Amino acid sequence: PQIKLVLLAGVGFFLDAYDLFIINQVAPMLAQVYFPKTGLPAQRQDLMKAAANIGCVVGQVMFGVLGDSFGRKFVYGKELILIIVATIFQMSAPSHWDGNRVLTWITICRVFLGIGIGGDYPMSATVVSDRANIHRRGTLLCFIFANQGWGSFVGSLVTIVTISGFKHRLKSGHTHDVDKAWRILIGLSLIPAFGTLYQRLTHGVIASKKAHWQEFVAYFSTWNHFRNLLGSMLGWFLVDIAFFGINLNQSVVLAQIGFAGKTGDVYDKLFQLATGNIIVTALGFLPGYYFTLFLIDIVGRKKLQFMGFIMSGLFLAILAGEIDHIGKGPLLACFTFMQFFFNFGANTTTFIVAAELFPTRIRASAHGISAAAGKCGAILSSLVFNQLKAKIGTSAVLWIFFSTCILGFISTFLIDETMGVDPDEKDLEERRAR
């Protein structure tokens, strides 16, 4: 009855999160094929990874305007087939082109892939909070956001099982078949995608649009009402810098650690790297959502956001100051703890807070702005991560993600705690006094 709605959101949020972080495990496969000596060129790699995040905001704009003036009934499944088509053209990049052309071929696909991802955001937010107007809504939201861990986890689980299947003999001799591997990692998202389709299947516009804008400006022209937007935009902007800047390039960081290898065949190289991703995502990235799941409505959003920023920042400082002076062991845990504390702290909080602060009359614009700000932080680091790594050093970049944590720690002060607070009644009692 009511449950079948939120599960679909989790599926759509498992799907786009999957496709989003899969690149982190496909990029090493493309290198071994089309760039074995010199690794993936920095700029060419970064654009491909930021593509889906760049496409993710233009999809919000495009599907946002086509939601006001209807081209389809809430444009449902339209976003889903666009990511499917984009997903297909990725894997079907013909095997005999050049290396660089295939890369540029994939980036374009991920942009349109992102466009579909931006259309699913108004689903996850609005279907729960405003329809329910009930306490402890956040516990329901975090369950959907937990699918982000499954997307990155299943992507890691699918990878190790796929590589182990090819390793039985085929890797000992046939090395180009890794070209098939990355095509399968992208392709397996079609089976749930087709299941979703199977579930989907089974005049005064400007005058009315500019009317709610005057109301929006009047609301957020008040200090107490204005500061709440900053915290939502800032925190989300800063996490997605380090969150996506790392998770989209998580395999690259693991390569800086002893996880690289320097010995073994091509299979051992791929399996160890896939072994690292599955460990970090199972021990930190994913459970941080479920730790968040059991405590947001007990401890509070801001309180976890502080910890998320301050702890992930703490370990980010240990990494940078000791990445070039300490072995595989200590550096691994601080990295997993960091990923643990992103989703256990600010990464999940920034998403939930943006929907719990604002009255329903303006929640649509604010959540879209804050999310877009988060995507900008996602695309910034994603677009520039690997480039700086060669120009400035990996430690220096980690000190940057450290500062974004402190700023997010500081920025969290601007937020009102939303535990048990109905934002609608908040507006009423305020308007009564005046």
Closest Cα partner for 117 from 139, 154, 152, 87?
Answer: 87
Q: If phi over 0 gives left and psi between -120 and 50 gives alpha, with beta otherwise, what is residue 204?
A: left
Q: Report the distance separating Cα 236 and Cα 316, nearest Å.
A: 18
Say which residues have a Cβ less than 8 Å from residue 180's Cβ, sequence separation at least 6: none
Per residue, what are the HEC states of the chain?
A: CCHHHHHHHHHHHHHHHHHHHHHHHHHHHHHHHHCCCCCCCHHHHHHHHHHHHHHHHHHHHHHHHHHHCCCCHHHCCHHHHHHHHHHHHHHCCCCCCCHHHHHHHHHHHHHHHHHHHHHCHHHHHHCCHHHHCCCCHHHHHHHHHCHHHHHHHHHHHHHHHHHHHHHCCCCCCCCCCHHHHHHHHHHCCHHHHHHHHHHHHCCCHHHHHHHHHHHHHHHCCCHHHHHHHHHHHHHHHHHHHHHHHHHCCHHHHHHHCCCCCCCCCHHHHHHHHHHHHHHHHHHHHCHHHHHHHCCCCCCCHHHHHHHHHHHHHHHHHHHHHHCCCCCHHHHHHHHHHHHHHHHHHHHHHHHHHHHHCCCCCCHHHHHHHHHHHHHHHHHHHHHHHHHHHHHCCHHHHHHHHHHHHHHHHHHHHHCCCCCCCCHHHHHHHHHHHC
Q: Report the distance separating Cα 420 and Cα 72, nearest Å.
A: 36
Q: Report the distance separating Cα 394 and Cα 198, nearest Å.
A: 45
- What is the tally of structural domains in the chain? 1
Q: Report the distance separating Cα 157 and Cα 274, nearest Å.
A: 8
Q: Whose structure tokens read 């180009």?
A: 176
Determination technique for this PDB entry? X-ray
Contact by Cβ (8 Å): 172, 265: yes
- Using only the alpha carbons of the chain, give its radius of gyration: 22
Query: For 322, what's the count of Cα atoms within 13 Å in the CB-facing half-sphere?
Result: 16
Contact by Cβ (8 Å): 377, 238: yes
Closest Cα partner for 348 from 401, 291, 422, 399?
Answer: 291
Q: Pull the structure tokens for residue 80.
A: 């889903």
Q: Pull the structure tokens for residue 301.
A: 């959003």
Show the domain range for 351.
3-202+204-433
Query: For 318, what's the count of Cα atoms within 13 Å in the CB-facing half-sphere?
Result: 18
Any idea what the Cα angle at residue 274 is, between residues 270 and 280, rounded to 5°?
A: 150
Q: Report the distance separating Cα 315 and Cα 24, nearest Å.
A: 21
Q: If phi over 0 gives left and psi between -120 and 50 gives alpha, with beta otherwise, what is residue 136?
A: left
Number of neighbouring beta carbons within 10 Å of residue 172: 12
What is the CA 4 to chain-centroid distance, rounded?
Answer: 24
Contact by Cβ (8 Å): 229, 220: yes
Closest Cα partner for 53 from 377, 365, 350, 364?
Answer: 377
Q: What is the resolution of this structure in A?
A: 3.7
What CATH number has the domain bearing residue 236? 1.20.1250.20
- For the chain, the straight-line distance linking the first and the last C-alpha, in angstroms and rounded, comes to 42
Say which residues have a Cβ less than 8 Å from residue 4's Cβ, sequence separation at least 6: none
Q: Report the distance separating Cα 209 and Cα 382, nearest Å.
A: 34
